[PDB]
Amino acid sequence: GMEGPLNLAHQQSRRADRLLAAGKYEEAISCHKKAAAYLSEAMKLTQSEQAHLSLELQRDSHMKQLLLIQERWKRAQREERLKA
């Protein structure tokens, strides 16, 4: 049903795993960047410091994912050229 920004951040995070497993690196990075943007929105709605700190760590986790996926994408791009 209904979707607020935290629900959308979680939806993008689920979609990013699907796309990365399919070898769709760029699309997976975009989902992690969208999830971080939606978390930035959800962080404006927190009423407690524990919820705020936890959403901030969740957003940073998407940044760590972006770095990992970028590195893996570069490796897959080089492999693609090597095998063509």
Side-chain angles (χ1 to χ4, degrees):
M2 272 187 285
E3 298 170 353
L6 182 51
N7 180 302
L8 279 177
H10 285 301
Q11 184 194 328
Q12 292 294 308
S13 187
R14 299 191 301 267
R15 181 67 177 160
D17 290 350
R18 292 193 174 93
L19 296 159
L20 183 67
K24 296 177 168 187
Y25 290 98
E26 195 180 349
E27 284 165 49
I29 279 152
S30 291
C31 288
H32 286 287
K33 290 175 58 167
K34 288 161 197 189
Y38 291 128
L39 286 155
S40 291
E41 295 178 337
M43 271 161 83
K44 296 221 173 74
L45 297 177
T46 61
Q47 288 185 19
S48 71
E49 188 56 15
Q50 76 270 11
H52 197 85
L53 290 166
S54 182
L55 290 185
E56 179 178 67
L57 178 54
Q58 194 176 150
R59 180 179 66 185
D60 197 34
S61 295
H62 282 294
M63 299 305 84
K64 295 173 181 172
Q65 284 290 352
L66 177 163
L67 289 157
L68 169 62
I69 296 157
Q70 276 277 15
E71 193 267 311
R72 296 308 304 193
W73 183 15
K74 179 182 183 173
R75 179 181 179 132
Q77 284 179 330
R78 293 189 74 187
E79 192 81 328
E80 201 72 13
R81 288 194 280 108
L82 186 72
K83 286 178 173 175

